């Protein structure tokens, strides 16, 4: 599986952007932010065609919301940028745009970053 | 207590880039690698100090848990509250660890690993950047 990192410490108004390669034969991809594995504040998963976000708490997948499709290339390097107050999480495609997403769980800090298989991490910037 | 990274997968050949900022208080800083915490390829523990003596960059390894025989490399100058960088590749005899002045030293691959999988640094070094290149 994909790259995981703990103790991130990622507060509000902190930028966390992840640049990466999309395989070539992908039909999506998975990138989960929270506290952990079991508690999540967003979890981004594009498909190749809508984008697929929802949360988890306590193991306990939330409501999805389902935002327009991001035309991810196949075998290209892409980057996605998150954000985010007490209100919400502000994910910013590579084309500039931007959609919201609830913080449902209150979280006050993002501590837990995992891709899966589908989403190669080559870059982890906070910003 | 610092960013914490596994499933890194770094090959041989490949460079682990990382960037990080040195706190303000900090007297030193640790940088871990290898393939998980108790399994460490590079311990890397710089002491740097322009107003005392210990001034070392403190190198080892741990397996099971266990320190290796410890070896020291001539200090490197980082700045306290600044923003510092640090290359590390590897191949089957040594890991090459590049310093921000394009200074390089050697370190052993004791437990000959094939791949690194494990990082974590401290509370000294809050890490800003981490590149795959």
Same mark, same amino acid.
């Given at each position: 599986? /994909? ?9 509000? /108004? ?14 999506? !991809? ?13 979890? !981004?998963?594009?498909?190749? *065609? $809508?984008?697929?976000? *929802?949360?988890?708490?306590? /193991?306990?997948? /939330? $409501? ?14 892409? +980057? ?18 931007? !959609? ?9 800090? @993002? ?9 190669? @991490?080559?870059?982890?910037?906070? +910003?």
């Amino acid at each position: 599986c /994909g790259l995981v990192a703990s103790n991130l410490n990622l507060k509000p /108004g902190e930028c966390l952007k992840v640049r990466g390669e999309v395989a070539s034969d992908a039909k999506s !991809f998975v990138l989960n932010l929270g506290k952990d594995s079991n508690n999540l504040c967003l979890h !981004f998963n594009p498909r190749f *065609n $809508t984008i697929v976000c *929802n949360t988890k708490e306590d /193991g306990t997948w /939330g $409501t999805e919301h389902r935002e327009p499709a991001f035309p991810f290339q196949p075998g290209s390097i892409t +980057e996605v940028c998150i954000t985010f107050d007490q209100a919400d999480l502000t994910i910013k495609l590579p084309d500039g745009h931007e !959609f919201k997403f609830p913080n449902r769980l209150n979280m006050e800090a @993002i501590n837990y970053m995992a891709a899966d298989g589908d989403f190669k @991490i080559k870059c982890v910037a906070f +910003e």
